[PDB]
Swiss-Prot record, chain A:
Protein name stated in the entry: Cytochrome c
PTM comment text: Binds 1 heme group per subunit.
Cysteine-cysteine disulfides: none
One of the record's GO cellular component terms: plasma membrane
Function comment: Monoheme cytochrome which is the immediate electron donor to P840 of the photosynthetic reaction center complex.
Subunit composition and interactions: Monomer. Component of the photosynthetic reaction center composed of protein subunits PscA, PscC, PscB and PscD. The reaction center interacts with FmoA (which forms the Fenna-Matthews-Olson (FMO) complex). The reaction center/FmoA complex has two PscA subunits, one PscB and one PscD subunit, probably two FmoA complexes and at least one PscC subunit.
GO biological process: photosynthesis
Key words of the record: Cell inner membrane, Cell membrane, Electron transport, Heme, Iron, Membrane, Metal-binding, Photosynthesis, Reaction center, Transmembrane, Transmembrane helix, Transport
Protein localization: Cell inner membrane
Key word Secreted present: no
Coiled coil, from the record: none
Gene from which the chain derives: pscC
Superkingdom: Bacteria
UniProt membrane topology term: Multi-pass membrane protein
Length: 105, 645, 630
């Protein structure tokens, strides 16, 4: 997909506000490459895993999947969504009555 | 042909091997439970916020509230106490699961040596404990599953007594016989400990005899226990739906509607293309932060109830189907081995006569056809009347058809909807039972294959060819797939009913006149969310609103219409297409490779194509049904007025 | 389903069948004409409106038979003209059916050598007939010249339109009909002085000529659909189409005037009980609706004709491969596929190019979706919004955007995807490289299984490949429908309530607000469908047909066969129990080839039964773009 930058230069488009025009085709090509690369990784890894799994893999499969989901939740707190959605004044409004109170405001 | 889904097959495993596998699974399950408990920490004991309300933990939560854990508190100190208890119990689960995994590995290797005392414990002969085993059994179950039911029930009694003790000491629930309050589950745990200890000692002194399973327990006992526990799981789902709707559970489930949740993937406050964090919708919350979803509008109580109930229900139905399939596999094994004529028990001898099989399957087919035709005619006639085609108003529809007053006790608002729900459940049960009976009886030879001289010689053979213009999908595996596809309808009915939908008609609530007048003529204090077809339109509002649910929607749909490719009769076309693909990839030769491309493009076997097709079909269907049950309850207790007075 | 096989019919049988069919077409044309007369000359209320007649109406307005005028007397005069023309169609169709029966049944008087309009039939064609098809191309062209000349003289004499050659009026149709008569006459006279040389269709040729002509007609129909979509959008055609937006239409099955239950009350006053409620044409965009119906009908009919032409050509190819005629065809249309190495090259190249472009466009679509839903923290600035048709290609599209790029790439990918199966039909009809490697040849146009071997061999036959071609072209036809109905095919959820879903209009600065993304299009069209009971009934019936197709699609025919044996035993036992010795009613289960036939029939039928609802609900595309979400 080395030609994406060229066609971006040849197309007449207005970039998104306050976003670099140079990196936009880079972003889109990175997304396309990521999608194709992750699909290929999934296909190849599962093709190799079908043949690599055995009775000696009994110690690996459950625990490895556990590790995957463990770091998945850890990422859910680490990089993806951090916090309890604290209110800017500082709160964790859990009671719906407070939600009506701030719908009044 | 040993595939990657046959390496863990029980035929290659011993009793100790499956013991080790079960213990490794229990430990891994404990580790996963620790993950979930950590995921439920709303405020970290460090003094910091917590995790964003995973569906796993949102399901786990009310049960934790039933215990001393997980207070329904907006107060930060008490919520920190909830987090502390959750984290401590998660660490305890982690430790116990680690020890369980260690024991499972020891039993997988058949290496049972105690580090403190250098002795080897024989799996066939031992004492359960130093003195307790000599007190009760004086030995070990002699490597026969029937002799183990006693000790197994004794162990279950021990576990019940331990649960009572844990509730008494750590969780602080004193047993009293008041069954409305929480502090009787421990009293009933003690009662069950007594009852199951009595049953265990009786079964140890007098082992029940069903000699079919003992020989090849690995499949016969597996099938019987799996079907039994599938029905047990269905019963547990029904009991859960009834109980979670009771006022006794209300302090632990209705309060879930009172409190709001910040879910992972729930839509965030949207910033603009130019947000100078040095324009933002909902500025009070921080940028890209999850907007609270109110439980009262979301119906989180019934959403969690539905998730639990349908999880257990579908797991039970799948377990029933798998039990029937594995029993069919065992029956095919003994049919090829000649042991089918030698079983000598009622569970086989009654089905040994092919005419009895014909009578049973014909009765099931007749009941299924009659009930299905009746209920389907009712549904389509209601649809016709409400859409007014052929000049029929809803006065001609089946609104009069309520459940019988004697049978009305088990419904909230008696209506045609409950009638159609019950009839559809019975019809789908018999519909799947047609294929389950086919697996049970026709594992080797159908009456047609008795008349036409063919016999099924494998559990995963594709077919028998184009002879007689047919032979597709007569393998017990393919009958299992058909049973699963047929029970998809029943499971869908279950989900739509528990979520709230008019199953008696198809388009209920559409801008048509007599579709809106259904509630006016039916006298219902409940306004069902919508009809069968209008259910998607009414319940995808939230699924579209939430980006995460939309992502699940897309992925499930992709999975389904990829299942399409392997479900159809196209394997030969795909094989020749793959050969063409291989030939052009070899044509990458003379494209300046100088590399022998030894990559034949693979195409799944039909026995594997149906496997993948059913797995993806079920997976997409119920990945989407998860969104059905995660859209919300959205049932308002307000009857609809007639469009015209 | 093979009862009118070409090998069973002679040439005169084909002539008779075609004549009978043209007569019945005239009869149904009269049926539509009398089905569209708004007010009778009787004065009584007439037929409300039909999608048949709403499709036909712009043509009648162009021809002056029917008018869009708002005067009751004008509509009565239009109805009188419609009835006159319908009677003319009835009578001429009756005559055509009479000829069809006199030609299907060989009773006349010389079909091998005859005279056609002998007074000048000796001037043209030397007073003799067209002995063979190559000699028949000439007289066929001259007959079409006579048809064009007849249209011209009828338009001048009866419809009273001028020969003015300006291309912005019906007088253009008159002038160009005369010009086409002249051109067809020239082509026919040349062909009579020199018959063509494509010998493959001059031997036993019924199936071969039929296949090639059906493929040509299918491509002609696709071209006609594109041409009609462009022209019906042109302002010159606007007087005949855009007035559909300015008029109201009462269509059957619309929400009736809703009655009460204590009524001797009604919803709307002065409109009687159970009366079809009025609809405004501006809300439906009835001009776009009608052109969508016509264009998509032509497009799908062309696609199906191409697929069936390829299938019948494959039938003929198998025939000439079985009797050894394949290896001695001097026509280049066989020499380019006879080597069986160019076949592999062609199919592999088509597969690879289809794979590359389809993977590219699918990746673009899913990335647009991901940037839409902010999955994995992707903003809308990470999407392919820079990606547009080039200014060189921009003249093809109005309001150029990623939507048009994805539409073009998707339609090309779908064309190549169906072309994979079409080429498989075209080349591997008797010999396939795999089946040459396996040592097993094929001998029938419908052999479904050939047994479970090498994992299974389902769906190799020519007929099964036709079914697969139709299945894969369903996606291309859906793309066409969703583009002509205004759906945003570039992404999956556009205009949906979510983050950065409206933002497209603020990002691409579009002058046309498209309807919805792929998955939000169903919702935004069913919001209007569910009002109509007729469209709802079509919706449910189409889905019913679609899922009943799966009972014969799946690899389950043998299970159905043993279940039918069980059902037969049950029925016999029960009918012998409650009734005396009645033994009958074997349960018929379709064979696997016929199972695929029925499955494709139901699948296509339902799918496009529902696509009709997509194209008939309304356009519902606004020119005002969505605001930024900010
Ligand atoms: C309700 C309790 C159920 C039950 C629930 C389960 C569950 C749940 C699991 C097993 C597993 C196994 N069970 Mg069991 N099983 C029951 C009754 C039996 C009986 C019997 C009474 O005769 C026998 C002999 C077995 C025998 C076995 C083996 C096939 C296997 C463990 C040994 C091994 O080391 O695996 C070698 C391999 C491993 C232990 C791990 C391999 C990796 C992963 C974890 C396999 C997951 C498969 C699948 C996704 C499980 C999904 C459940 C669904 C979500 C509903 N089960 C009872 C009635 N059993 C596991 C197994 O492997 O299933 C195929 C498993 O998943
Ligand atoms: C067992 C494998 C895993 C594990 C996985 C799970 C899972 C999975 C769950 C819990 C949950 C619980 N775990 Mg644990 N947990 C383990 C180890 C432990 C140990 C321990 C010292 O071993 C303890 C004290 C606990 C403590 C607890 C409680 C905090 C909590 C509720 C228990 C309860 O209601 O039981 C009830 C006890 C009984 C019914 C009696 C004992 C079991 C009897 C003998 C077996 C029959 C009943 C069976 C469970 C249900 C079948 C019903 C049919 C009608 C037959 N875990 C190991 C590591 N834990 C629950 C949760 O968090 O809820 C939200 C939960 O569902
Ligand atoms: C009731 C307790 C258990 C049960 C316990 C067993 C046992 C024990 C055995 C089987 C075995 C089999 N099970 Mg079972 N099984 C149950 C539920 C089912 C269901 C179902 C969806 O209802 C199905 C389709 C199957 C399927 C099958 C077959 C694979 C196989 C029997 C073949 C045969 O010839 O049967 C012939 C048919 C019958 C004998 C039917 C009649 C049943 C009983 C004996 C008679 C009285 C019941 C009466 C008819 C119904 C009304 C009263 C009831 C109390 C409701 N199980 C429940 C969960 N199943 C056997 C096998 O080999 O496993 C591998 C085996 O060993
Ligand atoms: C022969 C079958 C039936 C019949 C069935 C139909 C059908 C079906 C339709 C009509 C329609 C019409 N018919 Mg009529 N009609 C018949 C007899 C007649 C007679 C008569 C002389 O009796 C007349 C005056 C008419 C008049 C008319 C008009 C009112 C109307 C529009 C015609 C027009 O566009 O034609 C223009 C005429 C021509 C261009 C003549 C040449 C035809 C060309 C060759 C057709 C193929 C073109 C295509 C591009 C392929 C070319 C491929 C190769 C390159 C050559 N019909 C008989 C009874 N009638 C149409 C309708 O109602 O529109 C809404 C319509 O589609
Ligand atoms: C112009 C574009 C096509 C073309 C269009 C058609 C179409 C379209 C049809 C035929 C049909 C036939 N074609 Mg042709 N035909 C072409 C060129 C050829 C050539 C040639 C090149 O010389 C040959 C040899 C043939 C050969 C044949 C025969 C196999 C058959 C005529 C026999 C008869 O009984 O049909 C008469 C058969 C019918 C009466 C049954 C099928 C039609 C329907 C079911 C009935 C008509 C009424 C209709 C449904 C009423 C409308 C109701 C409203 C929708 C509400 N075609 C080109 C390639 N031809 C017909 C046939 O059935 O083929 C199998 C047919 O339908
Ligand atoms: C353009 C004119 C016609 C056409 C005319 C013919 C003729 C005539 C015959 C067939 C026949 C067949 N047709 Mg064709 N066919 C067309 C469209 C198609 C399409 C399609 C593109 O979707 C398909 C899949 C088919 C399918 C088939 C096969 C069943 C069969 C050829 C087998 C083979 O060996 O071919 C090998 C051939 C090729 C690989 C292509 C040959 C191309 C020739 C050499 C022309 C020059 C190509 C060049 C790029 C064009 C530049 C433009 C110039 C102005 C010429 N047709 C169009 C509509 N077809 C044969 C049959 O038996 O019919 C029953 C036959 O005799
Ligand atoms: C509503 C649509 C459907 C039916 C109607 C039906 C009828 C039927 N089928 Mg089916 N089926 C699917 C849908 C329908 N299958 C799908 C979408 C799949 C994809 C996986 C599928 C798959 C399999 C496999 C693999 C096998 C079967 C059989 C089997 C039966 C045998 C006896 C039986 O089940 O009695 C129980 C009786 C019923 C199942 C039918 C009662 C009528 C009802 C009220 C709906 C009426 C629908 C409609 C109005 C009728 C037509 C009238 C008008 C519209 C022109 C049997 C009556 C097989 C056997 O013969 O043995 C069981 C077998 O092996 N299937
Ligand atoms: C997303 C859905 C689908 C594909 C992806 C696909 C891929 C594919 N198939 Mg398919 N298929 C259906 C859906 C899909 N079939 C349905 C619903 C039916 C029911 C009728 C069906 C049936 C047949 C028959 C009967 C035959 C085939 C073939 C054939 C190919 C050979 C080369 C080619 O056509 O490339 C053109 C196709 C591609 C560009 C596909 C690769 C990227 C893609 C753009 C989207 C990427 C989607 C992604 C891979 C999913 C997960 C990503 C991640 C998690 C790993 C070939 C690449 C056959 C041959 O080998 O020759 C054509 C053959 O005989 N089919
Ligand atoms: C090179 C490929 C370019 C093709 C796309 C061009 C295009 O869309 O046309 C350009 C015009 C669209 O151009 C403009 O698009 C606008 C979008 O809002 C509006 O629709 C305008 O009216 C229209 O003029 O499209 C048409 O005229 C035809 C549309 C349907 C496409 C027909 C293809 C039929 C092929 C079917 C094969 C299926 C096989 C399976
Ligand atoms: C169109 C589906 C055609 C189809 O699938 O194949 C036809 C299939 C069986 O048809 P037959 O080939 O058996 O026709 C009777 C034969 O004996 C001769 O025609 O079932 C039907 O008849 C369906 C009827 C629907 C009308
Ligand atoms: S279609 Fe496929 S599964 Fe069915 S009989 Fe033929 S080869 Fe076997
Ligand atoms: Ca819902
Ligand atoms: Ca539309």
């Amino acid at each position: 997909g080395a030609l994406f930058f060229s066609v971006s230069f040849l197309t007449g488009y207005i970039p998104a506000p306050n976003h670099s025009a140079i990196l936009t085709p880079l972003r889109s090509f990175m997304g396309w490459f990521l999608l194709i690369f992750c699909a290929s990784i999934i296909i190849m890894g599962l093709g190799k895993m079908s043949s690599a799994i055995s009775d000696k893999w009994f110690l690996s499969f459950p625990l490895s999947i556990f590790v995957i989901v463990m770091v998945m939740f850890l990422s859910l707190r680490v990089y993806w969504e951090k916090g309890r959605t604290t209110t800017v004044d500082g709160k964790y409004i859990r009671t719906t009555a407070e939600l009506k109170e701030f719908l009044n405001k | 042909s040993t595939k990657w889904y046959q390496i863990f097959d029980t035929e290659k495993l011993d009793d100790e091997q499956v013991v080790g596998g079960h213990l490794a699974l229990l430990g891994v399950l404990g580790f996963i439970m620790g993950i979930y408990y950590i995921s439920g920490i709303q405020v970290f004991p460090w003094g910091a916020p917590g995790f964003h309300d995973n569906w796993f933990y949102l399901t786990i939560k009310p049960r934790m509230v039933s215990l001393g854990i997980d207070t329904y508190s907006t107060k930060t100190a008490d919520l920190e106490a909830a987090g502390a208890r959750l984290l401590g119990w998660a660490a305890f689960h982690f430790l116990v699961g680690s020890v369980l995994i260690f024991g499972g590995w020891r039993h997988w290797t058949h290496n049972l040596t105690n580090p403190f005392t250098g002795r080897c414990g024989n799996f066939r002969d031992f004492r359960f404990l130093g003195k307790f085993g000599d007190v009760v059994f004086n030995g070990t179950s002699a490597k026969s599953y029937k002799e183990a039911l006693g000790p197994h029930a004794v162990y279950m009694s021990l576990l019940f007594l331990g649960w009572g003790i844990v509730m008494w000491a750590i969780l602080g629930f004193a047993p009293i016989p008041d069954f409305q309050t929480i502090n009787s589950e421990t009293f009933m745990s003690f009662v069950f400990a007594v009852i199951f200890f009595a049953l265990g000692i009786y079964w140890w002194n007098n082992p029940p005899n069903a000699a079919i399973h003992l020989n090849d327990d690995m499949k016969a006992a597996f099938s019987v226990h799996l079907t039994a526990i599938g029905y047990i799981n269905i019963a547990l789902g029904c009991i859960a739906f009834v109980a979670f709707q009771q006022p006794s559970f209300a302090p632990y489930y209705k309060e879930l509607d009172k409190l709001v949740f910040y879910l992972y993937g729930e839509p965030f406050n949207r910033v603009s293309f130019n947000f100078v964090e040095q324009a933002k919708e909902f500025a009070d919350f921080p940028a890209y932060a999850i907007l609270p979803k109110s439980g009262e509008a979301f119906g989180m109580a019934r959403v969690v109830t539905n998730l639990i109930v349908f999880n257990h229900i579908i797991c039970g139905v799948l377990y029933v189907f798998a039990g029937v399939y594995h029993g069919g596999q065992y029956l095919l094994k003994i049919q090829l081995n000649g042991m089918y004529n030698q079983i000598k028990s009622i569970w086989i001898t009654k089905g040994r006569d092919q005419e009895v099989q014909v009578k049973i399957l014909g009765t099931v087919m007749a009941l299924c056809f009659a009930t299905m035709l009746s209920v389907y005619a009712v549904i389509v006639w209601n649809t016709i009347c409400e859409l007014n085609i052929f000049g029929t108003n809803i006065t001609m529809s089946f609104y009069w058809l309520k459940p019988l007053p004697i049978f009305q006790w088990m419904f909230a608002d008696p209506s045609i909807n409950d009638w159609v729900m019950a009839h559809v459940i019975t019809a789908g049960s018999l519909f799947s039972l047609i294929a389950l009976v086919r697996i049970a009886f026709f594992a080797h030879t159908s009456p047609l294959w008795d008349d036409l001289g063919l016999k099924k010689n494998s559990y995963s053979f594709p077919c028998l060819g184009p002879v007689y213009g047919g032979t597709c999908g007569v393998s017990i595996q393919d009958q299992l797939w058909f049973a699963m596809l047929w029970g998809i309808k029943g499971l869908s009915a279950v989900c739509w009913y528990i979520d709230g939908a008019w199953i008696a008609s198809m388009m209920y609530g559409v801008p048509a006149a007599d579709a809106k007048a259904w509630d006016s003529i039916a006298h219902l204090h409940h306004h069902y969310t919508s009809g069968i077809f209008y259910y998607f339109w009414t319940e995808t509002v939230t699924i579209f609103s939430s980006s995460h649910l939309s992502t699940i929607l897309m992925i499930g749909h992709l999975v389904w219409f990829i299942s399409f490719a392997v479900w159809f009769e196209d394997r030969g076309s795909r094989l020749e297409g793959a050969d063409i693909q291989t030939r052009t990839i070899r044509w990458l030769g003379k494209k300046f490779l100088n590399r022998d491309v030894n990559f034949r493009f693979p195409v799944l076997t039909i026995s594997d194509s149906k496997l993948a097709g059913t797995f993806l079909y079920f997976g997409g269907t119920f990945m989407l049904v998860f969104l059905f049950l995660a859209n919300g309850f959205y049932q308002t207790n307000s009857p609809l007025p007639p469009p015209v007075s």
